[PDB]
Amino acid sequence: MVSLTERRKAETRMEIARAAARLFVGQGLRATRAEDIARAAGVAPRTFYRYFATKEEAVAPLYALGAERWVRAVREAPAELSPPEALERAVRHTLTPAPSWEWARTLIRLAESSPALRKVWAEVCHSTERGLVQALAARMSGGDDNVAVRLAASPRLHFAAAVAGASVRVAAEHWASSSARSPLEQALLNLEVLRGFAWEA
Amino acid sequence: TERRKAETRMEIARAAARLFVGQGLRATRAEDIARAAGVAPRTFYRYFATKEEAVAPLYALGAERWVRAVREAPAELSPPEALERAVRHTLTPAPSWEWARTLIRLAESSPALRKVWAEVCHSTERGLVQALAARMSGGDDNVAVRLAASPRLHFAAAVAGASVRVAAEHWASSSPARSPLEQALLNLEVLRGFAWEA
C-alpha cells in the first residue's frame, strides 16, 4: 500500500506534467515558462521546482508513462496469445486515447525540435526496447527464470524488440511530421511483419 | 576551407577514439582529446558539445558507407536485393575494421556514448529512405519525393537499420564469428514479401 501523502504528491507531479503538455500544445515550448506551467497546474513556482528542474523535465514523464504502460500490457496479455497478437493487443489497449492525438502530435514533434526532449525521446525508445526484450522473454519462458535469462540474451529477441519498437515509433514520428489521423492503424500494420518470426533461427 | 574543417573534425574523432579505447571515457576529458588532436579546447567545442559526441563521425563513416552501397548497388536489383548486396559489400574483410568492434563495445557500457551511437543509427534511417526512394523512382525526382514520404518505406528503412545495428551490437560484445554479416542477413529476412508500395 502507498501512503496517502505519496499518492497526493504523485497526483500533483502528474498535474504539472499534463499542464506542461497542454501549454506546449497550445502556445509551444519557447513561449512557455516554468511559472506559466505552475499557474496552469494551480501550484506555486516553489511546488513546480520541488518536482522538476526545467519545463522540459516537466513533460518528460508523459513520454515514459505511455511507453511503460504498453510494455506492461504486452507482458500481461493472456498467455496463449502469440507475440504479434500480444504486441497488437497491447497497442490497441494502451496507445489509443491514454494519449490524446493533438498532444501526441505536438510531443512527438517536440522530440524532433527540442534538444532536451530529443534526449528524453531517445531514452524512452531505448528503455522501451529493453522492456520489450524482458516482456517477450517472460511470455516465452513458461515461468523458468533461467530460460527467461537465456532468451533475454538472444540476438533474435533483441532484433524482434527493435522491430516492435520501430513499428510504433516510425508510425508515430512519420504521422507527427506529415499533415493520416490514425497512427494506430499504421502501427498495427507495421507489427504484422513479426508474424511467423523465427525465435530460434 | 570546409575540407580543412572536415579533416580537423575527423582528427578530433580519431584522438577521442584512441583515448576512450586506451584509458576509457571517465579518465578522458574534452581537454585531453583537444591536446591529443593538437587543437585548443575552444576549437573542440566549436565541433562537439561533449567528449562523447567527438566519436559520432567514426560511427557515421560505417553508417554512410552502408547507405552509399545501397544507392550504388546494381540498378536492376530490388530493394531487398540492394539491402542484401549493401550488407555483403559493407560487412566483409573494406579494410581492418576490428576498430569499430571496440567503439561499439564501449557504447554497451556508457549511457552518454550509447546515445551518440543511437543518434548516428537513427540519422542513417533518413539516408536509407532517400536511397531506397531514388532506386524505386525509375529516375523521376517527383516520384522519389512521394516515395520518401511513404510510411511503408520509413518502416522498411527502420527495420533494415535495426537489422544491421542489432547485429553490430551483438558482434561487438562477443569474444574476439568475425563479421556481423550472417546475423544482419537473418534479421533482414523479416522484410521478405514486404509491400514496398500501395
Short mmCIF file of C-alpha atoms in Angstrom, two decimals:
data_model
loop_
_atom_site.label_atom_id
_atom_site.label_comp_id
_atom_site.label_asym_id
_atom_site.label_seq_id
_atom_site.Cartn_x
_atom_site.Cartn_y
_atom_site.Cartn_z
CA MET A 1 0.00 0.00 0.00
CA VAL A 2 1.30 3.55 -0.89
CA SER A 3 0.86 6.29 1.82
CA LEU A 4 -1.85 8.92 1.22
CA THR A 5 0.81 11.74 1.23
CA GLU A 6 2.85 9.98 -1.53
CA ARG A 7 -0.35 9.37 -3.64
CA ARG A 8 -1.23 13.10 -3.30
CA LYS A 9 2.39 14.14 -4.27
CA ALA A 10 2.31 11.76 -7.29
CA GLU A 11 -1.07 13.24 -8.49
CA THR A 12 0.44 16.82 -8.18
CA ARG A 13 3.52 15.78 -10.23
CA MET A 14 1.23 14.32 -12.95
CA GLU A 15 -0.97 17.51 -12.93
CA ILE A 16 2.17 19.64 -13.51
CA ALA A 17 3.30 17.25 -16.36
CA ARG A 18 -0.16 17.46 -18.05
CA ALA A 19 -0.18 21.29 -17.69
CA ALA A 20 3.27 21.36 -19.36
CA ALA A 21 1.92 19.23 -22.28
CA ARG A 22 -1.26 21.45 -22.57
CA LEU A 23 0.75 24.72 -22.82
CA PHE A 24 3.42 23.27 -25.17
CA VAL A 25 0.48 22.17 -27.43
CA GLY A 26 -1.44 25.50 -27.09
CA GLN A 27 1.45 28.02 -27.44
CA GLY A 28 4.65 25.89 -27.95
CA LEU A 29 7.82 25.42 -25.84
CA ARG A 30 9.62 28.73 -26.46
CA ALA A 31 6.74 31.00 -25.16
CA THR A 32 6.10 28.73 -22.10
CA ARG A 33 7.97 29.37 -18.78
CA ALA A 34 8.07 27.14 -15.65
CA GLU A 35 5.99 29.90 -13.98
CA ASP A 36 3.24 29.56 -16.69
CA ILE A 37 3.15 25.76 -16.14
CA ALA A 38 2.90 26.26 -12.34
CA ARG A 39 -0.08 28.68 -12.80
CA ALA A 40 -1.73 26.29 -15.33
CA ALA A 41 -1.43 23.40 -12.73
CA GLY A 42 -2.70 25.63 -9.85
CA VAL A 43 0.56 25.45 -7.77
CA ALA A 44 3.30 27.90 -6.60
CA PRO A 45 6.60 28.05 -8.59
CA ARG A 46 8.29 26.54 -5.44
CA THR A 47 6.00 23.43 -5.88
CA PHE A 48 6.96 23.23 -9.61
CA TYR A 49 10.67 23.21 -8.71
CA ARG A 50 10.10 20.53 -5.94
CA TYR A 51 9.40 18.05 -8.84
CA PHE A 52 11.12 19.49 -11.95
CA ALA A 53 14.36 21.46 -12.59
CA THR A 54 13.11 22.71 -16.04
CA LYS A 55 9.99 22.96 -18.20
CA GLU A 56 11.32 20.11 -20.45
CA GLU A 57 11.70 17.79 -17.37
CA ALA A 58 8.02 18.57 -16.54
CA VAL A 59 6.71 16.89 -19.76
CA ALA A 60 9.43 14.16 -19.69
CA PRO A 61 7.30 11.74 -17.59
CA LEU A 62 4.46 11.61 -20.21
CA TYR A 63 6.77 10.06 -22.91
CA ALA A 64 7.88 7.38 -20.36
CA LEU A 65 4.37 6.65 -18.98
CA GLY A 66 2.80 5.66 -22.34
CA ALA A 67 5.86 3.51 -23.26
CA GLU A 68 5.86 1.70 -19.88
CA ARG A 69 2.06 1.00 -19.93
CA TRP A 70 2.43 -0.52 -23.48
CA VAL A 71 5.34 -2.75 -22.39
CA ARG A 72 3.39 -3.89 -19.29
CA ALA A 73 0.25 -4.73 -21.39
CA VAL A 74 2.49 -6.88 -23.69
CA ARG A 75 3.77 -8.90 -20.63
CA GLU A 76 0.30 -9.22 -19.01
CA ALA A 77 -1.66 -10.15 -22.24
CA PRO A 78 -3.38 -13.60 -21.96
CA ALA A 79 -0.58 -16.26 -22.01
CA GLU A 80 -1.93 -18.27 -25.03
CA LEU A 81 -1.60 -15.20 -27.37
CA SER A 82 1.31 -15.25 -29.91
CA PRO A 83 3.93 -12.43 -29.60
CA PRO A 84 2.37 -10.47 -32.56
CA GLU A 85 -1.17 -10.84 -31.01
CA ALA A 86 0.12 -9.70 -27.57
CA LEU A 87 2.02 -6.72 -29.15
CA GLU A 88 -1.04 -5.68 -31.24
CA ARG A 89 -3.48 -6.18 -28.35
CA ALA A 90 -1.26 -4.08 -26.00
CA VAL A 91 -1.08 -1.25 -28.67
CA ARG A 92 -4.91 -1.15 -29.08
CA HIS A 93 -5.46 -1.31 -25.27
CA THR A 94 -2.88 1.35 -24.15
CA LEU A 95 -1.93 3.77 -27.04
CA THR A 96 -5.49 4.78 -28.21
CA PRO A 97 -6.80 7.96 -26.47
CA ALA A 98 -4.20 7.39 -22.57
CA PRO A 99 -2.61 9.85 -25.08
CA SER A 100 -4.85 12.48 -26.88
CA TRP A 101 -3.87 12.75 -30.63
CA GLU A 102 -3.36 16.59 -30.65
CA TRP A 103 -0.95 16.13 -27.61
CA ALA A 104 0.92 13.12 -29.16
CA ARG A 105 1.40 15.06 -32.45
CA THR A 106 2.93 18.09 -30.63
CA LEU A 107 5.02 16.00 -28.14
CA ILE A 108 6.38 13.73 -30.92
CA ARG A 109 7.22 16.90 -32.98
CA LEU A 110 8.99 18.44 -29.87
CA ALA A 111 11.09 15.20 -29.56
CA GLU A 112 12.48 16.25 -33.05
CA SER A 113 12.59 20.11 -32.44
CA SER A 114 13.82 20.47 -28.76
CA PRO A 115 17.37 19.28 -27.88
CA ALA A 116 16.31 18.47 -24.27
CA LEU A 117 13.22 16.45 -25.48
CA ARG A 118 15.22 14.73 -28.30
CA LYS A 119 17.29 13.15 -25.46
CA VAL A 120 14.13 12.25 -23.42
CA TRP A 121 12.55 10.57 -26.51
CA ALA A 122 15.85 8.69 -27.20
CA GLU A 123 15.96 7.46 -23.55
CA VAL A 124 12.31 6.25 -23.73
CA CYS A 125 12.93 4.45 -27.12
CA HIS A 126 15.97 2.66 -25.58
CA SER A 127 14.24 1.65 -22.30
CA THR A 128 11.09 0.53 -24.25
CA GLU A 129 13.31 -1.78 -26.42
CA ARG A 130 14.94 -3.24 -23.24
CA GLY A 131 11.48 -3.60 -21.59
CA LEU A 132 10.04 -5.38 -24.70
CA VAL A 133 13.04 -7.82 -24.58
CA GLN A 134 12.13 -8.57 -20.91
CA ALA A 135 8.35 -8.83 -21.70
CA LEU A 136 8.93 -11.15 -24.73
CA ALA A 137 11.40 -13.31 -22.65
CA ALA A 138 8.74 -13.63 -19.85
CA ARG A 139 6.00 -14.59 -22.40
CA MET A 140 8.22 -17.42 -23.80
CA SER A 141 9.94 -18.69 -20.57
CA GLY A 142 6.93 -20.74 -19.22
CA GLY A 143 7.91 -19.36 -15.73
CA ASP A 144 11.50 -20.76 -15.90
CA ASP A 145 13.84 -17.89 -14.70
CA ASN A 146 16.97 -19.47 -16.32
CA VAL A 147 15.06 -19.81 -19.66
CA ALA A 148 13.93 -16.10 -19.34
CA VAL A 149 17.66 -15.09 -18.85
CA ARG A 150 18.87 -17.09 -21.96
CA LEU A 151 16.01 -15.64 -24.11
CA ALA A 152 16.69 -12.01 -22.95
CA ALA A 153 20.35 -12.55 -24.05
CA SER A 154 19.18 -13.82 -27.54
CA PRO A 155 20.03 -11.56 -30.55
CA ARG A 156 16.69 -12.86 -32.05
CA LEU A 157 14.73 -11.23 -29.14
CA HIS A 158 16.87 -8.01 -29.31
CA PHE A 159 16.01 -7.77 -33.07
CA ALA A 160 12.24 -8.62 -32.55
CA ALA A 161 12.04 -5.90 -29.82
CA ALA A 162 13.75 -3.30 -32.08
CA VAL A 163 11.19 -4.18 -34.86
CA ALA A 164 8.25 -3.96 -32.39
CA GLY A 165 9.53 -0.60 -31.10
CA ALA A 166 10.19 0.74 -34.67
CA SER A 167 6.61 -0.40 -35.60
CA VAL A 168 5.09 2.12 -33.12
CA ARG A 169 7.90 4.76 -33.27
CA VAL A 170 8.02 5.09 -37.11
CA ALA A 171 4.16 5.14 -37.23
CA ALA A 172 4.20 7.95 -34.58
CA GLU A 173 7.18 10.06 -35.92
CA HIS A 174 6.01 9.77 -39.55
CA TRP A 175 2.34 10.53 -38.58
CA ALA A 176 3.52 13.59 -36.48
CA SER A 177 5.64 15.09 -39.34
CA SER A 178 3.01 14.51 -42.21
CA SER A 179 -0.33 16.50 -42.39
CA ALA A 180 -3.49 10.22 -41.63
CA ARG A 181 -5.39 10.96 -38.30
CA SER A 182 -4.76 7.28 -37.11
CA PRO A 183 -1.10 6.41 -36.30
CA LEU A 184 -2.71 3.29 -34.63
CA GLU A 185 -3.56 1.58 -37.98
CA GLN A 186 -0.03 2.12 -39.37
CA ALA A 187 1.49 0.77 -36.09
CA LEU A 188 -0.67 -2.43 -36.24
CA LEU A 189 0.21 -2.95 -39.96
CA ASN A 190 3.92 -2.49 -39.06
CA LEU A 191 3.62 -5.07 -36.22
CA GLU A 192 2.23 -7.68 -38.73
CA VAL A 193 5.85 -8.02 -40.05
CA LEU A 194 6.62 -10.15 -36.90
CA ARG A 195 4.04 -12.87 -37.91
CA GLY A 196 6.00 -16.14 -38.39
CA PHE A 197 9.23 -14.68 -36.91
CA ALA A 198 11.86 -17.42 -36.24
CA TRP A 199 12.58 -17.08 -32.50
CA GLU A 200 15.39 -19.78 -32.82
CA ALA A 201 16.84 -19.39 -36.40
CA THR B 1 38.47 25.60 -46.13
CA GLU B 2 35.46 23.22 -45.49
CA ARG B 3 37.80 20.27 -46.48
CA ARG B 4 40.31 21.53 -43.82
CA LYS B 5 37.45 21.87 -41.19
CA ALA B 6 36.18 18.31 -42.01
CA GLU B 7 39.77 16.87 -41.70
CA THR B 8 40.10 18.63 -38.24
CA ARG B 9 36.70 17.16 -37.12
CA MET B 10 37.91 13.65 -38.14
CA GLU B 11 41.36 14.18 -36.44
CA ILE B 12 39.48 15.10 -33.18
CA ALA B 13 37.24 11.99 -33.55
CA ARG B 14 40.27 9.66 -34.06
CA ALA B 15 42.02 11.24 -31.00
CA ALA B 16 38.84 10.71 -28.93
CA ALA B 17 38.56 7.04 -30.10
CA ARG B 18 42.28 6.37 -29.26
CA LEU B 19 41.93 7.71 -25.68
CA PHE B 20 38.49 6.10 -24.99
CA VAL B 21 39.99 2.74 -26.15
CA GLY B 22 43.36 3.16 -24.29
CA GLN B 23 42.12 4.56 -20.89
CA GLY B 24 38.27 4.65 -21.15
CA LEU B 25 35.76 7.54 -21.00
CA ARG B 26 35.96 8.63 -17.36
CA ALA B 27 39.79 9.21 -17.48
CA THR B 28 39.37 11.23 -20.75
CA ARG B 29 38.34 14.92 -20.65
CA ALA B 30 37.40 17.02 -23.67
CA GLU B 31 40.61 18.99 -22.93
CA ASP B 32 42.73 15.75 -23.22
CA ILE B 33 41.06 14.97 -26.58
CA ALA B 34 41.84 18.54 -27.72
CA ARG B 35 45.57 18.20 -26.73
CA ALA B 36 45.83 14.75 -28.44
CA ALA B 37 44.34 16.30 -31.65
CA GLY B 38 46.61 19.40 -31.41
CA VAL B 39 43.69 21.94 -31.10
CA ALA B 40 42.61 24.40 -28.36
CA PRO B 41 39.58 23.48 -26.13
CA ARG B 42 37.65 26.34 -27.91
CA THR B 43 38.19 24.50 -31.27
CA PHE B 44 36.97 21.20 -29.69
CA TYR B 45 33.73 22.85 -28.51
CA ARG B 46 33.23 24.53 -31.97
CA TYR B 47 32.65 20.95 -33.35
CA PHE B 48 31.38 18.89 -30.34
CA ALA B 49 29.15 19.78 -27.32
CA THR B 50 30.61 16.87 -25.22
CA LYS B 51 33.52 14.42 -25.33
CA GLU B 52 31.14 11.52 -26.35
CA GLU B 53 29.88 13.49 -29.39
CA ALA B 54 33.52 13.52 -30.69
CA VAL B 55 33.25 9.83 -31.87
CA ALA B 56 29.99 10.40 -33.91
CA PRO B 57 31.99 10.91 -37.16
CA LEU B 58 33.61 7.45 -36.80
CA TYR B 59 30.22 5.70 -36.25
CA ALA B 60 28.88 7.91 -39.15
CA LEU B 61 31.63 6.54 -41.54
CA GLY B 62 30.32 2.94 -41.33
CA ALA B 63 26.67 4.12 -41.50
CA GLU B 64 27.24 6.29 -44.62
CA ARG B 65 29.28 3.51 -46.40
CA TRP B 66 26.25 1.18 -45.92
CA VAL B 67 23.75 3.83 -47.15
CA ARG B 68 26.06 4.59 -50.17
CA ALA B 69 26.34 0.83 -51.08
CA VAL B 70 22.50 0.72 -51.13
CA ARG B 71 22.34 3.64 -53.64
CA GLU B 72 25.27 2.30 -55.81
CA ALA B 73 24.06 -1.40 -55.87
CA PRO B 74 23.46 -2.66 -59.47
CA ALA B 75 20.34 -0.71 -60.70
CA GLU B 76 18.22 -3.82 -61.65
CA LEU B 77 18.36 -5.24 -58.04
CA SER B 78 15.10 -4.98 -55.99
CA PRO B 79 15.16 -3.02 -52.65
CA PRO B 80 15.67 -6.24 -50.58
CA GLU B 81 18.45 -7.40 -53.03
CA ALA B 82 20.05 -3.88 -52.82
CA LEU B 83 19.89 -4.04 -48.98
CA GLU B 84 21.42 -7.58 -49.04
CA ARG B 85 24.12 -6.53 -51.58
CA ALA B 86 24.96 -3.38 -49.48
CA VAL B 87 25.29 -5.52 -46.26
CA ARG B 88 27.58 -8.11 -48.00
CA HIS B 89 29.74 -5.30 -49.53
CA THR B 90 29.90 -3.27 -46.22
CA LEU B 91 30.50 -6.21 -43.77
CA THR B 92 33.25 -8.39 -45.45
CA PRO B 93 37.04 -8.13 -44.73
CA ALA B 94 36.70 -2.99 -46.73
CA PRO B 95 39.88 -2.56 -44.57
CA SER B 96 40.71 -3.85 -40.99
CA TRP B 97 37.63 -2.56 -39.04
CA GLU B 98 38.12 -4.51 -35.74
CA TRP B 99 38.45 -0.81 -34.63
CA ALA B 100 34.63 -0.48 -34.97
CA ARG B 101 34.35 -3.55 -32.66
CA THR B 102 35.86 -1.70 -29.66
CA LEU B 103 33.99 1.68 -30.12
CA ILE B 104 30.63 -0.14 -30.47
CA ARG B 105 31.56 -2.32 -27.41
CA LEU B 106 32.35 0.92 -25.41
CA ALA B 107 28.77 2.20 -26.12
CA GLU B 108 27.50 -1.02 -24.39
CA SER B 109 28.92 0.35 -21.05
CA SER B 110 28.40 4.17 -21.27
CA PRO B 111 24.92 5.81 -21.41
CA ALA B 112 26.32 9.05 -22.94
CA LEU B 113 28.20 7.11 -25.74
CA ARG B 114 25.25 4.70 -26.29
CA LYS B 115 23.16 7.86 -27.07
CA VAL B 116 25.71 9.07 -29.70
CA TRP B 117 25.69 5.58 -31.39
CA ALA B 118 21.85 5.55 -31.27
CA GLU B 119 21.67 9.07 -32.86
CA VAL B 120 24.02 8.01 -35.72
CA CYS B 121 21.96 4.78 -36.37
CA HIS B 122 18.76 6.95 -36.30
CA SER B 123 20.21 9.52 -38.82
CA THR B 124 21.14 6.62 -41.16
CA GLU B 125 17.36 5.81 -41.44
CA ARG B 126 16.63 9.11 -43.27
CA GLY B 127 19.53 8.41 -45.72
CA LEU B 128 18.22 4.84 -46.32
CA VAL B 129 14.71 6.24 -47.06
CA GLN B 130 16.21 8.71 -49.60
CA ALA B 131 18.45 5.98 -51.21
CA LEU B 132 15.54 3.42 -51.46
CA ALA B 133 13.11 6.09 -52.84
CA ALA B 134 15.70 7.03 -55.57
CA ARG B 135 16.11 3.35 -56.68
CA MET B 136 12.28 2.78 -56.89
CA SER B 137 11.54 6.13 -58.66
CA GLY B 138 12.57 4.95 -62.20
CA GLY B 139 14.60 8.23 -62.42
CA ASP B 140 11.58 10.52 -61.70
CA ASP B 141 12.55 13.08 -58.94
CA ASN B 142 8.85 13.78 -58.01
CA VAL B 143 8.11 10.01 -57.75
CA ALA B 144 11.24 9.76 -55.44
CA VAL B 145 9.71 12.67 -53.35
CA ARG B 146 6.29 10.89 -52.96
CA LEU B 147 8.00 7.51 -52.11
CA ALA B 148 10.31 9.15 -49.45
CA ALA B 149 7.01 10.30 -47.78
CA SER B 150 5.67 6.64 -47.70
CA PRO B 151 5.10 5.18 -44.16
CA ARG B 152 5.93 1.73 -45.68
CA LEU B 153 9.43 2.98 -46.77
CA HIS B 154 10.03 4.73 -43.37
CA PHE B 155 9.20 1.40 -41.60
CA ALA B 156 11.28 -0.80 -44.02
CA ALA B 157 14.28 1.62 -43.54
CA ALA B 158 13.94 1.40 -39.71
CA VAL B 159 13.81 -2.44 -39.92
CA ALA B 160 16.83 -2.58 -42.28
CA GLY B 161 18.74 -0.18 -39.94
CA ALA B 162 17.76 -2.31 -36.86
CA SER B 163 18.89 -5.47 -38.75
CA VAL B 164 22.47 -4.11 -39.08
CA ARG B 165 22.58 -2.17 -35.73
CA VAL B 166 21.40 -5.13 -33.55
CA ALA B 167 23.84 -7.49 -35.45
CA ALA B 168 26.68 -4.92 -34.87
CA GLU B 169 25.89 -4.59 -31.08
CA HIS B 170 25.84 -8.42 -30.59
CA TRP B 171 29.01 -8.88 -32.76
CA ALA B 172 30.87 -6.08 -30.83
CA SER B 173 30.05 -7.57 -27.38
CA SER B 174 31.02 -11.21 -28.42
CA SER B 175 34.54 -12.78 -27.88
CA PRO B 176 37.42 -11.80 -30.24
CA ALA B 177 32.34 -15.04 -35.51
CA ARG B 178 34.26 -12.18 -37.27
CA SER B 179 31.69 -10.06 -39.29
CA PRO B 180 28.12 -9.21 -38.12
CA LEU B 181 27.10 -10.27 -41.71
CA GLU B 182 25.22 -13.53 -41.01
CA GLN B 183 23.15 -12.07 -38.12
CA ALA B 184 22.33 -8.98 -40.27
CA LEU B 185 21.15 -11.17 -43.25
CA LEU B 186 18.99 -13.35 -40.92
CA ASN B 187 17.50 -10.11 -39.44
CA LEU B 188 16.85 -8.73 -42.99
CA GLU B 189 14.79 -11.91 -43.86
CA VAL B 190 11.91 -10.29 -41.86
CA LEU B 191 11.39 -7.96 -44.93
CA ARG B 192 10.72 -10.93 -47.35
CA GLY B 193 7.34 -10.23 -49.10
CA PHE B 194 7.03 -6.70 -47.63
CA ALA B 195 4.80 -4.36 -49.78
CA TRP B 196 7.28 -1.62 -50.87
CA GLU B 197 4.32 0.35 -52.49
CA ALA B 198 0.46 0.51 -52.14
#
